[PDB]
């Protein structure tokens, strides 16, 4: 994998080592409020993260993941448009160069200022490898940042990013609560996509809330301190590490409010 964000390897690139970057259900994409439509069917949300161990943070030349265990129902998202149980693994971020771009999806067009996406595999697969093969595989709650108010659940993070500044690093990360980054409320959009990165595989039932967090400008500024780059390596600051748009194809989103 030589894949990246760059001009010569980046999202207009992934297609010749990835041929499904081209596929049926690829991710991010557009949301278009107006044609999104409610289902009244669709489950509340249910996000229990009470038990949530995370372990560590890890810089791995893409974004920086914050690890869970994921050996026992811990953390798990259930409800909304799920059918079983998802164990969250990992949460990680994509943000801009400018707060006025960085996130993957997008709201009418709109880009915001980064997105944070926490993802979970279905359990009835058994392992996140085994997950990933499958068309239910995971889900992955996305969550939007705006630039403003700082988010105080945040600060951690962005605390330990110095110690994780390039390629390869890893800090622990122990005791660390993810329900201090969710927004008020649970109203979200929903539709079947992909990984955003390679491999780009079609196994995620997005599940994208209307209501962003808002980050202050100092802590965006800090994520993009980190580096693309290994240590002792040329500096390449981790900024827009985004995937646009993809078409939407045949899918309908949903939401899951008037
Ligand atoms: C047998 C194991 C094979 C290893 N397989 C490794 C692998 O496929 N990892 C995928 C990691 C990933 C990428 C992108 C997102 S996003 N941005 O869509 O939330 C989430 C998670
Ligand atoms: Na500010
Ligand atoms: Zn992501």
């Given at each position: 994998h030589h894949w990246g964000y760059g001009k010569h390897n980046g999202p207009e690139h992934w297609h010749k080592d990835?041929?499904?970057?081209?596929?049926?259900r690829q991710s991010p994409v557009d949301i278009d409020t107006h044609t999104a439509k409610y289902d009244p069917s669709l489950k509340p949300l249910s996000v229990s993260y009470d038990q949530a161990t995370s372990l560590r943070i890890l810089n791995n030349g893409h974004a920086f993941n914050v690890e869970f265990d994921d050996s026992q129902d811990k953390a798990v998202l259930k409800g909304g448009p799920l059918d079983g149980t998802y164990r969250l693994i990992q949460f990680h971020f994509h943000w801009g160069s400018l707060d006025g771009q960085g996130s993957e999806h997008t709201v009418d067009k709109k880009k915001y200022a980064a997105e944070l996406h926490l993802v979970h595999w279905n359990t009835k697969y058994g392992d996140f490898g085994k997950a990933?093969?499958?068309?239910?595989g995971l889900a992955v709650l996305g969550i939007f940042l705006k630039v403003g108010s700082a988010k105080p659940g945040l600060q951690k993070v962005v605390d330990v990013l110095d110690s994780i500044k390039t390629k390869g690093k890893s800090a622990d990360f122990t005791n660390?609560?993810?329900?201090?980054?969710?927004?008020?409320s649970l109203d979200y959009w929903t539709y079947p996509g992909s990984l955003?990165?390679?491999?780009?595989?079609?196994?995620v039932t997005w599940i994208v809330l209307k209501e962003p967090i808002s980050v202050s400008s100092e802590q965006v500024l800090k994520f993009r301190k980190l580096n693309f780059n290994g240590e002792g390596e040329p500096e390449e600051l981790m900024v827009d590490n985004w995937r646009p748009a993809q078409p939407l194809k045949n899918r309908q989103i949903k939401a899951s409010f008037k």
């Open positions: 990835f041929p499904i970057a081209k596929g049926e990933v093969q499958q068309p239910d660390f609560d993810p329900r201090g980054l969710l927004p008020e955003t990165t390679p491999p780009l595989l079609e196994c």
